[PDB]
Amino acid sequence: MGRILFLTTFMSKGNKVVRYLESLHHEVVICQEKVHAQSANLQEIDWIVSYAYGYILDKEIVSRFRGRIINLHPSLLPWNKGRDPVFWSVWDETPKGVTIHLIDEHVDTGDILVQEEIAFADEDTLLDCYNKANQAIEELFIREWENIVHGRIAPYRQTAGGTLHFKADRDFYKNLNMTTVRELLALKRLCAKPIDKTFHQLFEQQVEMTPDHVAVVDRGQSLTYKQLNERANQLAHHLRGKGVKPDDQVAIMLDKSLDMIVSILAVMKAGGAYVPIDPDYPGERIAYMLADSSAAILLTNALHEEKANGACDIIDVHDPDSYSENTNNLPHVNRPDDLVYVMYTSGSTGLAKGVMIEHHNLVNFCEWYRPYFGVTPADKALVYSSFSFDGSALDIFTHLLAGAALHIVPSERKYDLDALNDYCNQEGITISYLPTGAAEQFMQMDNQSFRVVITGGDVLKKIERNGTYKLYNGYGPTECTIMVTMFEVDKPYANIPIGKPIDRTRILILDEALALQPIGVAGELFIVGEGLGRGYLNRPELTAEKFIVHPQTGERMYRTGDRARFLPDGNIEFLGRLDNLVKIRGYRIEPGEIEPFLMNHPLIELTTVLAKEQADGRKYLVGYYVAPEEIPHGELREWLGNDLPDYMIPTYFVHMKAFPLTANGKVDRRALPDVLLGEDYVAPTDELEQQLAQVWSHVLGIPQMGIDDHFLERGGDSIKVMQLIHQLKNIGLSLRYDQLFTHPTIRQLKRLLTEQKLEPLRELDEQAEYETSAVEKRMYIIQQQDVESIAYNVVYTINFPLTVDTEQIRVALEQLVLRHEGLRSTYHMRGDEIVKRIVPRAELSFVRQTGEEESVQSLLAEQIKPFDLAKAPLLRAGVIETADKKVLWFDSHHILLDGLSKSILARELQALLGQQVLSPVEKTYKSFARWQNEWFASDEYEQQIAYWKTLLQGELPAVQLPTKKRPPQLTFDGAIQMYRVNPEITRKLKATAAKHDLTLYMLMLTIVSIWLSKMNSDSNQVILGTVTDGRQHPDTRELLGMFVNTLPLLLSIDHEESFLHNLQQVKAKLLPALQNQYVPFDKILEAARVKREGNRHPLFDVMFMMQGAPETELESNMHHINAGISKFDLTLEVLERENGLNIVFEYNTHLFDEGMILRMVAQFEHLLLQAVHGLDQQVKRFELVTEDEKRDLFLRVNDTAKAYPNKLIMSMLEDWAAATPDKTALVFREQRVTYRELNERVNQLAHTLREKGVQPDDLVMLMAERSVEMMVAIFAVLKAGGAYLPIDPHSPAERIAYIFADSGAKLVLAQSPFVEKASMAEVVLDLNSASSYAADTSNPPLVNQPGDLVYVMYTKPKGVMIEHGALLNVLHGMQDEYPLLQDDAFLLKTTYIFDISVAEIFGWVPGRGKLVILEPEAEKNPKAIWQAVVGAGITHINFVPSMLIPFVEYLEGRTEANRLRYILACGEAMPDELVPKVYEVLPEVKLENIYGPTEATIYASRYSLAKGSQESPVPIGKPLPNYRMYIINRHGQLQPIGVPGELCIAGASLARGYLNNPALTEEKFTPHPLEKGERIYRTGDLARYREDGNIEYLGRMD
């Protein structure tokens, strides 16, 4: 009975087998972790039985246990060896069974001991099969174990054959194991000839089949196939004679006509592809297509010739010399992979993209179209669609190859469908493609000619039609040629499916991971096959992103962005777009976020606002609302206009009695009804306004710009304003950057430009060395000042799947090396000139490492090493391969790769990784460097630097942040915390900025400015740096290099004005800066009389960077790796990522603790949320501290609630003389008064007072210097009922008369000499004389309450009224922290015209301790005070930094003070040195720093100073029991940790106020909302909390 090692997948697997072995008394060891030769689970083992073990055993282990190592493999070996055996046995449909075998050297190949067949039912899921096989093999082992142990079985070698599978082979099928075996194999079937001819080859082939058949009809005129072919051949010979070659583009700008079809075919036959340009398009679209398309030839009319503005070499289709005599077919020069046409996508996501479609793409469609629709020459097709839409390639090309006749739609009849149907019935139009919009509308017509009406492009919903024609619903974007699927609408559907794939077309429904979705499961519609176009014109990055090579399958597929599912019958259901978001008039917004604003309308009950796209793709918003009666259109537009920008205002509003609902109660959005320029849209009037309207549409990628539309409300960024200025100078108009914002409409711009009064970047000739740009010089300077610094290393990481070939990544980067001079640029110092050298070729470091996900970052950090700017390439890369990922990392230098350069690098790396080619870089950085160097000598520069001189000449504001002690020199060690604005808030921000003619940058800038303002004591002027793109010359947009310029922003936050007003002022202050942005930061420093000095950065310590969303997917998946670097104190880098804002707080680790950034991070969020919701609120009303910070601040600082006895201080004196009469209570030199002796003396003096009308609040006055008489006077003034008002006998008489007159005191107790000094005293009971002492010694009745005054302390001085209970709170507070027990004693050092004496004078009676009345002679004398400490064994002593300094000067050499417990310093800020110096002079003693204003009853905060701790700023500490302390700014709101503010005390210990000075009392004791309406005392003292909560005194607010 031997031990047995059970190796299985998880612990409970094969547990039946384990239990059986144990019943045979086999000790079994279950192990799922990887076992090695040296594993402790191997010795004393007789058998090893593995069972789907997740690892392979070392060949040492297998040989050691020869004949004694069995594996339970759930497959009919040799079939399905290795991983996922059951699944592959089902997918590959290989023989099924379970096999117990001898593990041998290879994977699942040894001699079988016991094998058994198994069967899976069609209805079983792949999990069921997996389970059934696992159960069958376990039972098999249980039955034949005995035969195996005893060796009765004869092992037999596996049959020859089988299969093998690894972990990754199933990734493509991961989502399928919950499908039935039937369903699985059904998907297997669902996912299981070449094209030789070009179109004109087939057309010419068709011309020879039906030459005299009508080919094209245009009103009265018409051409036959022969005539069309010949006329096109004539133009083709002329076009080919003009240089047209394969893949060349020939623009065609004509109306639908015969010349149109002739020109189209003429371009093909010539060899090239025709770029169609509908002349009805606006000039903006018409100039764009001519420029973007590489077309030199423009086939056009004289009617439309001027619409090209001489941009193209025109070949007039009416000039007879444009047609050759030769009418024959030209020699074929085209392959099926050559371009046939270039269509431009919609202008929704911006400017259209040239879709490059190859011949085989069109031929495959036409070769499928003809037989699918049974097209014959008898058919007559309508040339209905604008020639620019591929819907017209359908119209023209599919029907020409079928011999059908084309019928140009009359311009008049195109949109008057009544006349269209008439024409269709007249001419007999049998087949045609109509866009869904026009199709549904045409169904209403009484058509009788059509047999097949194909539709698509938009969601078809209507099936009913007054015609006998088969309605066909087709789908497929322009990228995959007209349509990739076709459905025969045989019946109505809630979702009319788009059909099955067309010829040579496979369609995969894939999830985000590109893995197969089970049939019926929705996913992204991926198109594979012959329809896939070549890609986008001049957009290789977009081609690589949309035309992907599947990682598992290897097939090239197109990513449609559409959601669809396969229905059980094979047809595909179109489920709209994947993205919840939609781009409306230039903004990606969530239409459901407009719903609350509509529903907020009084008349509106429900609302469900969807996004609908016009026929031409223009997206508009429809706001459906359930209201009793229809609401006036203009009333809703104005309603939303009060809160939303134009683009969030639905173009149309639809009233409905109620919404259609789904089975789940949701609004059935599909069941909502369907429905232009917009109100206040003024079309251009003058020829100038038209030009201005064209440049606008181009810059903003949005058409139809009204002359009152605001630029920043139509998607205008600052980058786009630059494009406008650049493209206006091209148009001949000179516009200034700030002029665009002051004239943000074309009406305003037309008046601005009444002159109409070029300058490309001059590429330099080759030199050994070139000028560097100003910023190139700066980057170089920075790096050479710390050659070992990785501070400007630009490190990024991309997580690639294991399927990626690392060598492809390596090779792509090397191309980027050979493509951009920046990556071959080396910077050198030739004398005093920073100089760049261009290397022709550079070798890229590309390292490969294998590790684990746990060590990727560690392996990468070691790779981030400094760059030698004299060595190219300034870029390193590598791949860290883990079990899951191949992590691509690359590191570049900032002198080469700024944010935009990186976008260009990501852009182009994506193209190369996606097997695309890049156009050669037209310009070089060095050319811009020289241009800008010469521009620095122009008048424009002198005017720009003049702005900076005038702006930065005066005193500049400084922005102090709640940081740690600055390093003596600038450090760059840092870390990042990232705050995520969610997409919802981010759209709210963009909507706010657009609503009020602002950019998102201005908005975020004003939020950061307010944030910095609030953290800078709500300063009016804030200064912070920002980064401009620094791409001054428009010819530098595409160059890798350091362009970005740093700008200082002098912004003025007016906290009394609203947030918007602040936005306009910041805008007003920013635009001049951005107008003069091209002065190098270093030259702005010169003009500002500022130089790089010290531990602070020159003009600003906070950088605010902002870069828009990534331009490409690869850039999106690029993870900026911060190598522990912070270029400034703090950098807020708002990054548009995943429709939100990744606000990365890059901070100096020496200036901020992770907790200090976590708080500032939380504060910024809280503030950003307060701005977005407080557009019209005064900025002063925005809170900086978060509610969680207030709670923790209370918990850590103000959780001081400790119930205390309300029994009065003299009642407490009474009890002690009654319980322990004879104990020592006072000690003045030889006097050692007891509790009974003191109390009675007090009772005598008390009666005297009551006999002279001393009610509560009555103010008695004292001027008796340190003597028992003082205690008698106090303790008994208190007993009498009135308050004691101390006065100094040594003060001038003008003040004693002032204090007495202003106090209105009723009587005066003064030590015998000081009665004459109390001149003209109303009723003067000589303190010392016995006459002032009644013989009665009975404890008078305590009529005083805790609310009546106990003493009046004077500060023209002011008298602080403080009530009794306020004092008890303190005395019990100090007693808890610093108990003055019977053994203890208190020294009296501080003069009693100071709130500190009150502690001495009463801080002894709580614990029945004694009070040493130190003599006035020994007041400032520390040696004399030193005697008391040793003499009477003082335990409590109050002190001040001024007296505790000399007291310390008598150092350890003086000893004999064992009883001394506490030293309580107060009144002044304690120096740092005064703490440790004390400790060496007096160990075993507790030192305490105390703070308390006279208005807060003696004390307020305390800080215990540990012996083993040294404080840099000795804090005044946390508040006492029932004390609450608040640090507020000049607007009355709580400050966060570190931020200076006015210290305020609250609680039961606040002084009643100033005596008969109410204007002053209400000034300083203000009912604050932070104390639940109760008043706070404003101290006039600047302070700031610490991380732990201890308050730090900063000084009076002066």
Ligand SMILES: *P(=O)(O)OCC(C)(C)[C@@H](O)C(=O)NCCC(=O)NCCS
């Ligand atoms: P506008 O108010 O929309 O924005 C102004 C702007 C300074 C942000 C803009 O003109 C600009 O230059 N953005 C470029 C930001 C950048 O280049 N970041 C690079 C970081 S290395």
